Design a protein around this ligand. Sequence first.
Ligand code: CA
Length: 178
Amino acid sequence: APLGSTYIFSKGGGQITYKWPPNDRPSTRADRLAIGFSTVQKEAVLVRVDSSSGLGDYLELHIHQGKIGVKFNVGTDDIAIEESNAIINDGKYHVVRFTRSGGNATLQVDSWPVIERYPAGRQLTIFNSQATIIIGGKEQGQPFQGQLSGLYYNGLKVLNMAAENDANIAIVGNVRLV
Ligand SMILES: [Ca+2]
């Protein structure tokens, strides 16, 4: 189960935001995103990384009809991958792992088979000018309720950073440490 900081998200919702310095936003050709979670929800946004580049690039981990999935867009089309079978909303700890290299991507939950997505046609490869990581909710999305831990995004252990009141972190709403 979890290592390090855990946040509980209670009814009504809350959101932790990591905001990169505006003159030092990363653009990446490959990404790794993982998070640990426990919940009984059927619909929730867990994590979303948004860009400031006006190109619309994004990466989102969410639960839909009780199943964990990823949707992302690095410039071409919206790519959606769902782990359609793993039970993830039994209130027990689960880990979801996402990777991307260019336009290709994988998703895996727990010890279930890795899902490998190789989209057809022209694909862009850079996740441009990443501006914010939002955790536990988003504008136009349904807020997470449960516990989140072990958020790793391209090397950043975001929830541990939140736990020490990193200066790039903001926390709002109904969410608290452990
Ligand atoms: Ca792009």
